[PDB]
Design a protein around this motif. Structure first.
Motif, mmCIF file in Angstrom:
data_model
loop_
_atom_site.group_PDB
_atom_site.id
_atom_site.type_symbol
_atom_site.label_atom_id
_atom_site.label_comp_id
_atom_site.label_asym_id
_atom_site.label_seq_id
_atom_site.Cartn_x
_atom_site.Cartn_y
_atom_site.Cartn_z
ATOM 1 N N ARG D 50 6.449 4.799 5.196
ATOM 2 C CA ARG D 50 5.766 3.709 4.452
ATOM 3 C C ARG D 50 6.472 3.496 3.115
ATOM 4 O O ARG D 50 5.917 2.764 2.277
ATOM 5 C CB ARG D 50 4.289 4.064 4.252
ATOM 6 N N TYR D 51 7.663 4.082 2.953
ATOM 7 C CA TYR D 51 8.378 3.943 1.679
ATOM 8 C C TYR D 51 8.522 2.497 1.189
ATOM 9 O O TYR D 51 8.519 2.248 -0.018
ATOM 10 C CB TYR D 51 9.783 4.552 1.779
ATOM 11 N N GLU D 52 8.650 1.554 2.123
ATOM 12 C CA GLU D 52 8.998 0.170 1.789
ATOM 13 C C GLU D 52 7.809 -0.612 1.223
ATOM 14 O O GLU D 52 7.965 -1.362 0.256
ATOM 15 C CB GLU D 52 9.574 -0.593 3.010
ATOM 16 N N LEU D 53 6.633 -0.437 1.821
ATOM 17 C CA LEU D 53 5.458 -1.234 1.461
ATOM 18 C C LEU D 53 4.743 -0.710 0.205
ATOM 19 O O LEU D 53 4.819 -1.341 -0.849
ATOM 20 C CB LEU D 53 4.494 -1.322 2.652
ATOM 21 N N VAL D 57 -0.751 4.740 -4.506
ATOM 22 C CA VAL D 57 -0.275 5.309 -5.775
ATOM 23 C C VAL D 57 0.913 6.232 -5.516
ATOM 24 O O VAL D 57 1.876 6.252 -6.284
ATOM 25 C CB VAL D 57 -1.405 6.065 -6.487
ATOM 26 N N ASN D 58 0.831 7.000 -4.432
ATOM 27 C CA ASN D 58 1.953 7.814 -3.968
ATOM 28 C C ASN D 58 3.090 6.918 -3.470
ATOM 29 O O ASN D 58 4.225 7.054 -3.927
ATOM 30 C CB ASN D 58 1.508 8.788 -2.865
ATOM 31 N N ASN D 59 2.774 5.993 -2.561
ATOM 32 C CA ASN D 59 3.769 5.061 -1.998
ATOM 33 C C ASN D 59 4.509 4.255 -3.070
ATOM 34 O O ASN D 59 5.686 3.928 -2.901
ATOM 35 C CB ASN D 59 3.113 4.087 -1.015
ATOM 36 N N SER D 60 3.811 3.926 -4.155
ATOM 37 C CA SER D 60 4.425 3.243 -5.292
ATOM 38 C C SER D 60 5.408 4.179 -6.002
ATOM 39 O O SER D 60 6.572 3.829 -6.202
ATOM 40 C CB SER D 60 3.350 2.744 -6.267
ATOM 41 N N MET D 61 4.940 5.376 -6.349
ATOM 42 C CA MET D 61 5.773 6.381 -7.026
ATOM 43 C C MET D 61 6.984 6.832 -6.197
ATOM 44 O O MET D 61 7.964 7.332 -6.753
ATOM 45 C CB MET D 61 4.928 7.586 -7.424
ATOM 46 N N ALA D 62 6.911 6.669 -4.876
ATOM 47 C CA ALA D 62 8.052 6.921 -3.995
ATOM 48 C C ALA D 62 9.140 5.869 -4.221
ATOM 49 O O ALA D 62 10.326 6.198 -4.293
ATOM 50 C CB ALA D 62 7.648 6.901 -2.502
ATOM 51 N N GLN D 63 8.721 4.608 -4.332
ATOM 52 C CA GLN D 63 9.646 3.480 -4.480
ATOM 53 C C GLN D 63 10.444 3.563 -5.789
ATOM 54 O O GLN D 63 11.611 3.178 -5.821
ATOM 55 C CB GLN D 63 8.900 2.124 -4.397
ATOM 56 N N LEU D 64 9.820 4.070 -6.848
ATOM 57 C CA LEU D 64 10.483 4.216 -8.152
ATOM 58 C C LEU D 64 11.612 5.245 -8.113
ATOM 59 O O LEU D 64 12.751 4.928 -8.460
ATOM 60 C CB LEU D 64 9.459 4.572 -9.244
#
Lengths: 33, 299, 48, 155, 131
Positions: D50-53, D57-64
């Motif tokens: 789910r890295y892309e979408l 809060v975790n998924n967002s911090m992954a993208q950064l």
């Protein structure tokens, strides 16, 4: 094995073509004699 | 190698091998017969003596046990290769006896062609003549037929003649050579016979029970004659594969029975080549020439 | 490579058979001209 | 076994039918189980990153962090730039030419073997011609002998 | 330059001393533990028998669009697709080679019988001309 066979098959096939025409020549020769 | 042999004082007219292929005999004007060993350095061991005239033709027996040698001094001679010594002096020839031939595999019997006008048949043991077919004129070469029952001869009148030993008449006369025939040699087939003639053409014939009645088979070009009119001699190979001829052109002519092509016109000589000898075993060639020496070519 | 091994094996096999085929007739031609030597010989005897 | 290639310059469809009529007369472990099942079923195993979408809060911090790693991963590439690429392009040309040298070495030895065979074919094909011509002559000779022998018998 | 097992371009190539052939260390180490012998020549070979080799190292340019996302999703998916559909297609190729083997050997033996049948035919026809 496939390549060596197919080559040697059509090679051995030419033995027959030669053999058949000589066999044939022996017939009319002896027949007419 | 080329292996040129020397030690002869005048022309060598005749050179031939042991039918073993062991020893070499050559002869010519010097009135004696030199012998050599074919192998090693082609070295000379023995010299036979006695013949007052020129040795015009030497001939072996088919084992190699006694030597026949036709001399200019009206005589043939048979000698012992065992010793080199005379056993018989075939005298009685009324002129120049040029050609000699011992019967092969039959009773011991000899036909000699001479310049008297006769061909002479002789038995070695009796010291007497057997038969003699006086046609008209000089006979220059003579060879038997493998049955030892016809005798072939070639002279000045160009029609090769053959006598039957039992009816004693001109059995077979063949024609087609334009000038005098100088050499006959019947191949080891017992059938094919080779004829040199200074008209510049060589011919092949075949004596059989039945022949096409005109048995002029193969024809080759190349041989020469000139003011010399030396006696020119031919031979078959041991195999009936190559014909070797000499000529007054200093060129050893080697042709083939099969394609009649010129396999060789080899230079190397200085005077006319009178006789070429084939080794009964090897591809070894020995040339006797009028330049007073011999050649040992390997092919 | 094996085609060469199949050829170079049977190249003399194609040779050695035909040598006999020559030699079989070559043996006959002697006995042919043996009899041809015979049948000329008695011909003169009937001629005589 | 024997079939001359160089000599036989000259029925194949006929002989094929006669050969055809004589023929009318006469390891891996678990890996293989899931791989064969994936191919048979026609379904690829789903990777969830789910890295892309972007729980989000975790998924967002992954993208950064991956975007910062990305922008650092594009910096060290541009620093060298095209020099690092064209240096590998030169290696690929040394690798290529070596293969085509072996294509030639095989080409030469292949034609060299066929070259030796050719002489053998022409050697024997002549000898067979000698035999057959000789054989024909022998047959003719025997016929002639028979005719002549009969004549002698007739006398 | 390549490995003689997987068809890789090795990261730590090691050469065996019984048969001079370069393998990638992981793949040759696995073979020796499975059965302690050289894979190509079938000669006795152990892990201590191997000799590690050195080279100027191999470099792969990680694509411009390289992130955790495509490397997890798109690139890794394509790799297990390409492994799956190749070996299945390779298993299809091995099956036909064995079938086309059987058509080869049967047609061969069919030709042998023709030759044997014609070898009796020809020479007897030639013999009859002799007779």
């Amino acid at each position: 094995e496939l390549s060596h066979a197919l080559y040697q098959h059509d090679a051995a096939c030419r033995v027959i073509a030669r053999l058949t025409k000589e066999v044939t020549a022996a017939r009319e020769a002896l027949a007419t004699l | 190698p080329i292996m040129l042999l020397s030690g002869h004082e005048g022309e060598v007219y005749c050179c031939k091998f042991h039918p073993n292929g062991s020893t070499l005999a050559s002869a010519g004007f010097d009135r004696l017969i030199l012998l050599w060993n074919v192998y090693g350095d082609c070295d000379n061991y023995a010299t036979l003596k006695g013949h007052s005239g020129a040795v015009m033709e030497l001939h072996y027996n088919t084992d190699g046990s006694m030597l026949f040698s036709a001399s200019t001094d009206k005589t043939v001679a048979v000698w012992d290769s065992e010793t080199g010594e005379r056993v018989k002096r075939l005298k009685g020839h009324t002129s120049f006896v040029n050609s000699c031939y011992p019967a092969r595999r039959g009773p011991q019997l000899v036909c000699t062609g001479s310049d008297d006008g006769t061909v002479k048949l002789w038995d070695i043991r009796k010291k007497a003549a057997i038969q003699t077919f006086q046609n008209t004129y000089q006979v220059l070469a003579v060879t038997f037929n493998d049955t030892s029952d016809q005798i072939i001869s070639g002279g000045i009148d160009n029609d090769i003649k053959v006598w039957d030993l039992r009816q004693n008449k001109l059995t077979y006369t063949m024609r087609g050579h334009a000038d005098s025939v100088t050499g006959l040699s019947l191949s080891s087939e017992g059938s094919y016979l080779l004829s040199n003639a200074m008209d510049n053409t060589v011919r092949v014939w075949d004596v059989r029970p039945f022949a096409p009645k005109e048995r002029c088979v193969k024809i080759f070009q190349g041989n020469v004659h000139n003011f010399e009119k030396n006696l020119l001699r031919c031979s078959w190979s041991p195999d009936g594969s190559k014909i070797a001829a000499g000529s007054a052109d200093r060129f050893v002519y080697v042709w083939d029975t099969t394609s009649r092509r010129i396999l060789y016109k080899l230079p190397g000589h200085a005077g006319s080549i009178n006789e070429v000898a084939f080794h009964p075993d090897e591809p070894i060639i020995i040339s006797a020439s009028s330049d007073k020496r011999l050649y040992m070519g390997e092919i | 490579e094996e085609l060469k091994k199949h050829e170079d094996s049977a190249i003399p096999r194609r040779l050695e058979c035909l040598k006999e085929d020559v030699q079989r007739q070559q043996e006959r031609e002697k006995e042919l001209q043996h009899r041809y030597a015979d049948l000329l010989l008695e011909k003169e005897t009937l001629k005589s | 076994v024997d079939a001359l290639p160089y000599f036989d310059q000259g029925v194949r469809e006929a002989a094929a039918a006669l050969v055809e009529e004589e023929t009318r007369r006469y390891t891996d472990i678990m890996r293989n189980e899931f791989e064969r099942l994936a191919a048979r079923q026609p379904i690829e195993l789903l990777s969830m990153k789910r890295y892309e979408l972007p729980e989000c809060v975790n998924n967002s911090m992954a993208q950064l962090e991956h975007q910062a790693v990305r922008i650092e991963n594009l910096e060290l590439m541009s620093q060298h730039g095209c020099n690092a690429w064209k240096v590998y392009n030169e290696n690929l040309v040394h690798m290529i030419e070596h293969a085509q040298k072996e294509l030639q070495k095989l080409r030469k030895h292949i034609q060299d073997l066929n070259w030796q065979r050719k002489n053998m074919q022409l050697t024997a094909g002549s000898k067979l011609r000698e035999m057959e011509s000789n054989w024909v002559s022998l047959v003719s000779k025997n016929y002639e002998i028979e005719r002549t022998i009969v004549q002698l018998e007739n006398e | 330059l390549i490995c003689s097992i997987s068809n890789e371009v090795p990261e730590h190539p090691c050469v065996s001393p019984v048969s001079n052939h370069v393998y990638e260390r992981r793949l040759i180490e696995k073979y020796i533990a499975e059965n302690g012998t050289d894979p190509i020549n079938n000669q006795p070979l152990s892990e201590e028998q191997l000799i590690d080799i050195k080279v100027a190292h191999p470099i792969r340019p990680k694509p411009p669009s390289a992130t955790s996302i495509p490397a997890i999703l798109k690139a890794l998916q394509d790799e297990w697709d390409a492994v799956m559909l190749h070996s299945f297609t390779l298993r299809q190729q091995l099956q036909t080679t064995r079938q086309e083997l059987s058509h080869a050997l049967y047609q061969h033996d069919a030709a042998c019988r023709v030759i044997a049948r014609l070898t009796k035919e020809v020479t007897a026809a030639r013999e009859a001309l002799a007779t």
